[PDB]
Each structure stands twice: as structure tokens, then as C-alpha cells.
């Protein structure tokens, strides 16, 4: 029955990141 | 978890080099002075007496 270390919650996201400065065309 | 404090966005914006220019009433070309003088009636005769 017990199994310390067996499959728990399947890995999702885990190490999410993020885009940096997406910028915007404030020019012309 | 703890993804290195998962990525945070960089800082866009600031669409201007802080020069804040702008000129007030600028100079104007000097008016070439009208040399002072005096009107008159130069003729030929001054006192024929």
C-alpha cells in the first residue's frame, strides 16, 4: 500500500518563467 | 517548486531621453538702423540780397 516516493501529483509547470520587456512601438 | 522566484518582466517604457527641450522667444535680426539726418530744401539760391 504505502510507497513513499511513488508517483504523486504529475509534474505541471514546475518552473514557470516569464517574458521580459515586450516593448512597444513608441516611435515615428 | 520555487522556480527561482519564477521570471518577472523587464522594465519597458520611458520613451524619451530626458532632454525636455524647448526655446522661448529667440533672437531677431537687428533692424539695419536708419541713419539719422534731417529733411531740407537744398536748392540753388540761399540769400540773393
Amino acid at each position: 500500500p504505502g510507497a513513499p516516493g511513488s508517483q504523486g501529483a504529475p509534474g505541471l509547470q514546475g518552473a514557470p518563467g516569464a517574458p521580459g520587456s515586450q516593448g512597444a512601438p513608441g516611435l515615428q | 517548486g520555487a522556480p527561482g522566484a519564477p521570471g518577472s518582466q523587464g522594465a519597458p517604457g520611458l520613451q524619451g531621453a530626458p532632454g525636455a527641450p524647448g526655446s522661448q522667444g529667440a533672437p531677431g535680426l537687428q533692424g539695419a538702423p536708419g541713419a539719422p539726418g534731417s529733411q531740407g530744401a537744398p536748392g540753388l539760391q540761399g540769400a540773393p540780397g
Side-chain angles (χ1 to χ4, degrees):
Chain A
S6 176
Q7 62 88 29
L12 284 195
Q13 296 295 322
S21 189
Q22 180 94 30
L27 74 174
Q28 190 250 314
Chain B
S8 86
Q9 285 54 14
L14 181 82
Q15 289 67 351
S23 183
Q24 74 280 15
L29 298 173
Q30 70 85 20
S38 52
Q39 265 190 8
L44 210 58
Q45 187 57 69

